[PDB]
Design an enzyme around this catalytic site. Structure first.
Site, short mmCIF file in Angstrom:
data_model
loop_
_atom_site.label_atom_id
_atom_site.label_comp_id
_atom_site.label_asym_id
_atom_site.label_seq_id
_atom_site.Cartn_x
_atom_site.Cartn_y
_atom_site.Cartn_z
N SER A 1 3.20 7.63 80.79
CA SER A 1 2.09 8.02 81.68
C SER A 1 1.94 9.56 81.74
O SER A 1 1.50 10.16 80.74
CB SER A 1 2.30 7.42 83.06
N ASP B 1 1.75 4.44 77.25
CA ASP B 1 0.62 4.42 78.19
C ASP B 1 0.33 5.83 78.74
O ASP B 1 0.33 6.04 79.96
CB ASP B 1 0.91 3.41 79.34
N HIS C 1 0.44 -1.09 83.41
CA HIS C 1 1.03 0.22 83.34
C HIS C 1 2.56 0.28 83.59
O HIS C 1 3.30 1.00 82.89
CB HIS C 1 0.29 1.17 84.31
C1 LIG Z 1 -0.44 9.34 86.63
N1 LIG Z 1 0.53 8.29 86.89
C2 LIG Z 1 1.78 8.29 86.35
O1 LIG Z 1 2.30 9.18 85.70
N2 LIG Z 1 2.37 7.09 86.71
C3 LIG Z 1 1.56 6.32 87.50
O2 LIG Z 1 1.84 5.24 87.97
C4 LIG Z 1 0.24 7.09 87.66
C5 LIG Z 1 -0.91 6.30 87.05
C6 LIG Z 1 -0.01 7.40 89.14
CL LIG Z 2 -2.31 -1.31 85.11
#
Ligand SMILES: CN1C(=O)NC(=O)C1(C)C
Ligand SMILES: [Cl-]
Length: 371
Positions: free
Chosen positions: A219, A242, A297
């Site tokens: 993320s 992701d 996610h």
């Molecule tokens: C930006 N983000 C991250 O790095 N992890 C998460 O769960 C969200 C989407 C908030």
């Molecule tokens: Cl999700």
């Protein structure tokens, strides 16, 4: 239960903080171990991480106390402070956590890589993207173990662009510093861990395969992968799990010479974000993208294993896909990619077809239309 690694090696775990300041390196190390009779590793080791998770959720402080009651005794299957498995040079992954996470929350990934013969340095970021982190004000505070805690920063809409970009740049510098620290420990430099732990860092001398370096992250960590590659050519490839692309400056997109693999969940991704991934593509550059069917996610993080199937699905910690199924796909496709672009002489090419998304639970490329 967080799964045990699928590889042939037993897994050790320890923490390293050097120096003791808010500018030093803090990482959790996962590594091939010689012994398998050590106590398992405590998953979230301090109450303040639960206080920080509570702020990230936007709930009251005392919800922290409840998360601690639920999760504060939970372990992860790595032998705490076990001796390192001797007589082999190991490739190195530096790993970057997401927003609201911290170093300990991607042990399913870290253990799996370590069981296959990687050393894994899971950094804890001091950019206020972690739910919580700590360090020491000075030498005296470090000695007596008087921790200073730093908690997640909430942004205004006005701060979003500018501060997320400041943070991804600090995160990349933190990845480079962690790499330099491990390379110096490899090349024998005495380092006194700011943490008083029964793991001698001298064991790590001549144990790193010094050109076999990769950066992985989830993320916010997946943006950190891309920023880190554009800035530090010691990293030979990256894997963005992701990736949240928003923090990156416009300049970085044309500046990533290293191979880069995007592993996506089905339900997180959106056009603005996919368009940004596609801006990393150039005919001279090596790029791969796969999407895990039925995944969310959080499938990349350990909280996908921390609750039951039904509560998991409700809390969006779990997708329609089985969590062990999903992470096995991500870890095995990662190993095949690392083998390819690090030049490893292992059997990870058995999973080459997963890089191409050729599996019933894989989508080649993306499910997202960008027209
Ligand atoms: C930006 N983000 C991250 O790095 N992890 C998460 O769960 C969200 C989407 C908030
Ligand atoms: Cl999700």
């Amino acid at each position: 239960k967080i799964p045990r690694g699928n590889g042939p090696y037993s897994v050790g775990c320890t923490d390293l903080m050097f120096d003791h300041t808010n500018k030093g390196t803090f990482l959790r190390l996962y590594y091939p171990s010689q012994d398998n009779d050590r106590l398992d590793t405590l998953w979230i080791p301090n109450k303040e991480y639960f206080w920080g998770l509570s702020k990230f959720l936007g709930t009251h402080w005392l919800m922290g106390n409840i998360l601690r009651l639920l999760f504060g005794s939970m372990t992860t299957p790595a032998n705490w402070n076990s001796p390192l498995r001797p007589g082999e040079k190991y490739p190195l992954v530096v790993f970057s956590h997401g927003l609201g996470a911290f170093r300990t929350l991607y042990s399913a990934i870290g253990i799996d890589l370590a069981s296959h013969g990687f050393i894994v340095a899971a950094v804890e970021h001091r950019d206020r993207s972690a739910s919580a982190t700590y360090y020491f004000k000075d030498q005296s505070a470090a000695e007596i173990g008087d921790k200073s805690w730093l908690y997640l920063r909430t942004l205004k809409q006005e701060e979003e662009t500018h501060i997320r970009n400041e943070q991804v740049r600090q995160r990349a510098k933190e990845c480079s510093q962690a790499l330099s620290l491990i390379l110096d420990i490899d090349h024998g430099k005495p380092v006194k861990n700011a943490l008083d732990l029964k793991f001698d860092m001298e064991q790590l001398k001549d144990s790193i395969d010094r050109e076999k370096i990769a950066v992985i992250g989830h993320s916010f960590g997946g943006a950190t992968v891309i920023q880190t590659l554009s800035e530090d050519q010691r990293f030979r490839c990256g894997i963005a799990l992701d990736a949240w692309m928003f923090p990156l400056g416009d300049e970085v997109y044309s500046r990533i010479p290293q191979p880069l693999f995007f592993i996506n969940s089905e339900y997180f991704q959106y056009p603005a974000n996919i368009i940004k991934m596609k801006k990393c593509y150039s005919p001279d550059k090596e790029r791969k993208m796969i999407t895990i069917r039925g995944s969310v996610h959080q499938n990349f993080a350990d909280f996908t294993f921390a609750t039951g199937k039904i509560i998991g699905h409700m809390l969006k910690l779990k997708g329609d896909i089985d969590s062990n199924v999903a992470i096995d796909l991500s870890n095995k496709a990662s190993l095949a990619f690392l083998q390819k672009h690090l030049g490893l002489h292992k059997d990870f090419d058995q999973w080459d077809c997963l890089i191409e998304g050729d599996d019933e639970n894989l989508i080649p490329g993306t499910n997202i239309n960008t027209t």
